[PDB]
Subunit: 387 residues, 4 copies
Amino acid sequence: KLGLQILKIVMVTTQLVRFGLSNQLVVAFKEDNTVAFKHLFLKGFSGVDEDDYSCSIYTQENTYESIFFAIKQYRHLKNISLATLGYGEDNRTGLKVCKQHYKTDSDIETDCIHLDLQVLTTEPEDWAQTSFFRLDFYRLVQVDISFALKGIDLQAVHSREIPDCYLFQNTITFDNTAHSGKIKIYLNSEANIEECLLVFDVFVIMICLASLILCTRSIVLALRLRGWYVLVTISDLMTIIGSILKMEDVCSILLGTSTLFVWVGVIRYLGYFQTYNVLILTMQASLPKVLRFCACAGMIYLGYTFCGWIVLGPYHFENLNIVAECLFSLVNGDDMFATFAQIQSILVWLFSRLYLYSFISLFIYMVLSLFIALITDSYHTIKKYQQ
Amino acid sequence: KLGLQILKIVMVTTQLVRFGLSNQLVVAFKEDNTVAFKHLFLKGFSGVDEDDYSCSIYTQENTYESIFFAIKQYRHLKNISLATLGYGEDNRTGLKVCKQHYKTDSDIETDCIHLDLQVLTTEPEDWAQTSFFRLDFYRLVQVDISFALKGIDLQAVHSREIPDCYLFQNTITFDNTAHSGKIKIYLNSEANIEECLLVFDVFVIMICLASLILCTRSIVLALRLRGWYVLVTISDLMTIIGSILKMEDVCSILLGTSTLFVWVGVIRYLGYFQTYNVLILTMQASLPKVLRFCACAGMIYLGYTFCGWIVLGPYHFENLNIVAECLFSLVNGDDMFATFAQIQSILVWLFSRLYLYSFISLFIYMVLSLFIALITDSYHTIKKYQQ
Amino acid sequence: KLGLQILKIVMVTTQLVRFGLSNQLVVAFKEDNTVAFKHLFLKGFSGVDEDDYSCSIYTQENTYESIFFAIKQYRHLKNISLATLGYGEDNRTGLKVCKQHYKTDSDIETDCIHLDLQVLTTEPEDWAQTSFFRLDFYRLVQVDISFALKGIDLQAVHSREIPDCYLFQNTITFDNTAHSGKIKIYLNSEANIEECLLVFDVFVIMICLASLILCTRSIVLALRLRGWYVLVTISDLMTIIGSILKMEDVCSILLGTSTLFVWVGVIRYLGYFQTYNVLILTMQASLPKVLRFCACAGMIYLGYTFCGWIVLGPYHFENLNIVAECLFSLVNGDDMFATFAQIQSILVWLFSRLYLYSFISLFIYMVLSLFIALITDSYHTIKKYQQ
Amino acid sequence: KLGLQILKIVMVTTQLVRFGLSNQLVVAFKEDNTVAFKHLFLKGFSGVDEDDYSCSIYTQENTYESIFFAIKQYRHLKNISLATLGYGEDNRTGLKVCKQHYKTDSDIETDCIHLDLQVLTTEPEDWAQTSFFRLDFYRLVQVDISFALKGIDLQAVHSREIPDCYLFQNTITFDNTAHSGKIKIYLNSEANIEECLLVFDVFVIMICLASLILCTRSIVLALRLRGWYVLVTISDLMTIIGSILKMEDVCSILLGTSTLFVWVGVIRYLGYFQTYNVLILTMQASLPKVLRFCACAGMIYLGYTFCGWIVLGPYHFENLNIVAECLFSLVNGDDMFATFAQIQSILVWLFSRLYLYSFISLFIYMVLSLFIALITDSYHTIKKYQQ
């Protein structure tokens, strides 16, 4: 089981490199088109990829300029853009502007008016003078602009075989829900194909099935006689199910974890040399005390995250995941001075100061030193075991 | 006291999550309106949230453009803004421009002229040519523009019950006190409501009172027989007083510290397993030597902060809190290269260099290694105690 | 062999300082001219040195403006620039615009039209209305603008001797290969000279040859009797071959590694004091166990890099090298919060979260503490050896 | 010597806080005026405080616009600025434009034409068409604009006593020495006063003289009987000489180091408690082995800095101080990913990668772990000494 397992290492590594490079190319085309949509249909989109909202409006005239800008850029799409884009399909072409507003109270009704491309390319501003583009900013909820663009890929034609098509369904929104003098703008784009070797994969399937059967022979041998082979069977299952989902993302996660446990199994096969045996036994003998200490430090960590979220929430810290990520950065060095910079509030400032000093001092000293003291004890006991 | 205490954990955690999310929403509305005031009333406010001053003027024409801009945006507030804003109340509407200047010497007198909206709403601009808007930049101290805006929240009406109102009291200032060719601009905004379940909280009060009485029964039992229960009583007091201030911020700090000690008490109840007992006894036995070493390192740290403040103050470092935060970042790795970048001054440069090298080398090596050597000694003595 | 070896230290250090300062000056001139080409020939080049592409176009009108801008700036080069630049040589002056496009399919033919400077300096801009500057953005591959500029250096004339000349061969490209609505712009510049003491280096050659012969006498003495002298002979070879390539970059790498091993040999000659002997024996006795543990941690590290590349590739991570660099930063603390910021995708987000926490916790704790436990064991065994 | 020494602590701390705050205010006025000069006299100075050069010109028209801009802003200084500035004194008012250029070769002659303010305030701009403002960018070396501005401080009049004046001597330069198509712009400003309690300091002098005499009594007592008192006498000398230079910066460095050793002496007086005695004896017993190991690691560090400077110099790294600061950041975690980002060059790229990995791995592991192993050994030997 030397060549059959090294062949697993090499074949699953090649499968993951080819598959990851394929999805790299495809998602590069996806985000290239959505950035090249944000530069066309959003007014004043600077190129600084700002946030999940691409920009935000603070006045009641840039709203009209952005709406009329999106409609005029959609009308002159053929001149303006420089991809291979063209109008698609409500089973019709042209825009569809839905706006939402309160009933003069409680109900959010919507008024959605469709705009065909013959209405736009007649070219008097007749749609621009209708009452539908009169907006009551006292009671506007949102304005959504939606349309459908098809785009041929030609990087596939570049140095490879011909056929590929796409279809984009864009939705430009004007999110005014926190009625607080700020409209955010989104561009939610989709993409899905239409018209206009499995040998390596089944090969990896056969390799992982044979390794699974032979490792279960080893498992039942160890059962009748009486866990790295558990991880080898796990890697078998993850590669086979990842190959099923690759055949008919989740499959990316399956192949990624499978190759991670593949290289951990290589770290097992380094253990024939006895120095790697010393290191592996150090990790195996020290792991549960580390898990218990990580659990206790995690409970103290939760106490600090709830305290920092319900105090320094307004002064930084919005979600608990953001607070947990920032405090895990603060323990590990980075983002340290930025937290002291974002805090000005006199008593709350003093609380923030001794909070951060107590947190950093306590966790770094009495947690990193304790994790060193666990591993040093385990390593010297294993040195005494080999003496 | 298992269910009564785990009910405290979960119940005070739910109280803090609900209360923190409520204040998150309210302060999100507050800062959304003050950013949407800075974008309306400050000329050339780029959206880069620059400092506590939002921008700064370096000439004597952008001053006039910013003042006249603030007045004209206040006049066209109904067209310009896109919240639900409206003019409020000097018991009157309209602006109130107070400017301060030296007596041709010693006295800073002020000249404050009020501007009603009927004066602005005249078709000719006649306020712009009074002598009050002639400024002597030899002797101008500050110019303050103040007004009052009311704004209905409608995110409360969004998917919840209706009633909410506000009243903002803005104060645009032109701070020229360091008479040094630089006017800073502020927008100091306020907010306070006007017109146009306590079951969970009293439930937490009852839980914490019952736990307080029963833990005092445990305290007097330990007294008559002869400190985690001290922290449990502390958590009782902090949740009860936080519930009082929530009933009739400080209450945020009370609830945050209370939940922090709540999860520390959970870390106590992890101690029934003996590995957590080993870790907790390691921390308890090693804490006072760590405190004495932190005190001595803090005195050396104060020596370095006073030296770096009175030397590298001009070349970076303004307040002692800023110097202490930057040096606490420098010990923990972050902001390391930025301090070497901000320093050019030949002998003072050499002093800065060996200052930073001596500081980082001395504290990181002979303090982090000493904190490891304390904890390793304590952990091996406790291992010998359990052997 | 005291003076002959310290003379090697100081002499090769002086050689490297002089040679590195010479190449510093020359490459400073090179990048100064290529930045001053990007500011002249690229439209809207902000001065923010953006990427290997200097800027990118997202519309089909800034393409025409950038092409016509590059041609007009080349025509007015004598007025526009402020170096000593002049037109050079296709064996002719003037531009040469080659554009590439698909055959209406499969073939990428090219159409390359040359533009002499007398054609540019006509009173009408009649080249701007030829059909060659009609572009089909459905099928355009790239547009390349190329020309040749000569430029005299005068910093050489500044405070030194006279003669120096250059010749630049610029190539402005409009890279539209990912046919995805985005043209990137490059400026690929070249430089090569034309017309218009070796005593120190041969001295280093003689020093290193004498030290090489005498250290081989020491080697054959140790052979007939039965490895720092190996590193001294290595430093001899690297300085001699670096002096050969300096006589007739690679020579930069040779001299850099040679001086690195020069100062490592100085660290050897610190070993006459016995404290440095303790430290050097600690490193020598602890090195192979460190190498085996680094190998095992490197295999686990490869598992994490393949997993993070094939999962968090779309959400960050393009090449495997970039993933390895970012994870080596994450272990050492830097770029910690930036990885949590660039991730939003719900299940993939959860996977990213426990991926990063498991990675940081496992490697920092059970690798840094294990490396400390190796060195502490080796140092105490060497302390027992000296007791 | 308890009260006499604690009085030294408190009085020298108050002296340093008052003196540092005084110089903070004065240098705040200095840099406020030089930023408010860069915003007036430099064209397009964005407010991004870019470098020691405030901006840089890449064309031959922004040169003329910046020169003519500086002259016109100097002419309209009274309208443009908003400090209390006024024209000062060549013993005359007005500008003095010196330009330097090559002799058609070798000699850099200069042509310096003075401009009185009456020449500027003529009804035509007849100075703008003299031949002196014709520039040969083939052979221009630099253009320098110089003038003298006086400015009254009024922050001194704000809430304090009256008298203060200043005089600024600005020098706007157009540095074209690397004749490489890039003019840098400087604004070198000066400042010096003209016309228009020592009780605390002599008190600290008396305290430090009395402590110096009494500590020399302790020194001669220890001499006749047979070093913290050495540091106390050092602090005496540094405070006295700093008070001399404060009476009649260097004095900032003297007072900063004196207060640093003051708080180190406080760390000595913490040693009456025996835990601080343990920590202080740990540092004192472990210091020389740490110094020898720091020396050996510094020699290896010099090897890496010379190698990285003569290789990665062109691809990052200009001065050896910059390389040493960046590598000291790389050891301490910070600036880690930025060094991998700034490197693209295939073999040199591979050299950069294994350079950085070998550097970080070798120094962090086999230096930080060795520094921990020194301190742990010293601390356990001192624990055995107290057992």
